[PDB]
Amino acid sequence: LSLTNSSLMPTLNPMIQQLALAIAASWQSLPLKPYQLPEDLGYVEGRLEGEKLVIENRCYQTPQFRKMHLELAKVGKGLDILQCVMFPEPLYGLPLFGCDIVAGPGGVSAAIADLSPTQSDRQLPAAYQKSLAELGQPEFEQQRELPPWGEIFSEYCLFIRPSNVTEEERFVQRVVDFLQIHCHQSIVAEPLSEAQTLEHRQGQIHYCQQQQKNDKTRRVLEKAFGEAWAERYMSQVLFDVI
């Protein structure tokens, strides 16, 4: 988690670097243990007929979070990516923290962050609704509309092209705020009933199945590794259906 031994970090877009540091800082004092990905994956690289894709995978778990996954990636010299999902243990009924950042030489093209629901009513728990409302509406100049599979995201989801450094920093601060809320709620959550645990598990499964519809990720993986590898990666490493 120190990221001090990351080979990608020094070379990534500055907003991605700050967000990776913020996520690692939020996690570093939790009761973590490593989470072994399929084939105990860590670093991976591949190329076919075009650019090389390199990915650093870090993955942890705690009693409240089944899987805490931070990926950093680069395609060639032209494209940097940060992905993070905290998959909740359904027993505690927490939402799914996620973010995705994509940047080119011209700057960040896409910045997405959310606390996504797992309840059948598609609502965040009441305490999250209350704390999120208290943050107020952030202003961003270049909003982007989610694709249809993005129905899984909450009404608090951010999806923008940052317009300037002020917006990059506002976005990172909102992600910090989401993580502060989420980590706090993880302390004040208890084991749920078996029926409720089941309901939350179903919400998480749905989230993973919808994330697998994102062809933006799939094409990048396929161009470097091919169709079969990408399908394994997306279904077994990124968005495993529990």
Ligand X SMILES: C=CC1=C(C)/C(=C/c2[nH]c(/C=C3N=C(/C=C4\NC(=O)C(C)=C4C=C)C(C)=C\3CCC(=O)O)c(CCC(=O)O)c2C)NC1=O
Instruction: Report the interface residues with ligand X, using CB under 6 A.
Output: 55, 71, 73, 81, 83, 85, 98-100, 102, 109-110, 112, 114, 146-147, 150, 159, 214, 216-217, 220-221
20 vs 112 by CB, closer to ligand X: 112
31 vs 106 by CB, closer to ligand X: 106
| Alpha-carbon distances of 25 from 2, 28, 30, 106, rounded to whole Å | 8, 5, 10, 28
**What's the closest the beta carbon of residue 112 comes to ligand X, in angstroms?**
4
Query: If we measure between CA atoms, which residue out of 140, 164, 216, 158 comes closest to residue 14?
Result: 164
**What's the closest the beta carbon of residue 188 comes to ligand X, in angstroms?**
24
Which phi and psi (to 5°) does residue 193 adopt?
-70, 160
38 vs 191 by CB, closer to ligand X: 38
164 vs 193 by CB, closer to ligand X: 164
**What's the closest the beta carbon of residue 197 comes to ligand X, in angstroms?**
23
Broken C–N links (> 2.5 Å) in the chain, after residues: none
**What's the closest the beta carbon of residue 224 comes to ligand X, in angstroms?**
9
Q: Are 44 and 50 in contact (CB under 8 A)?
A: no
Strands 33-34 and 107-116 come out as unpaired
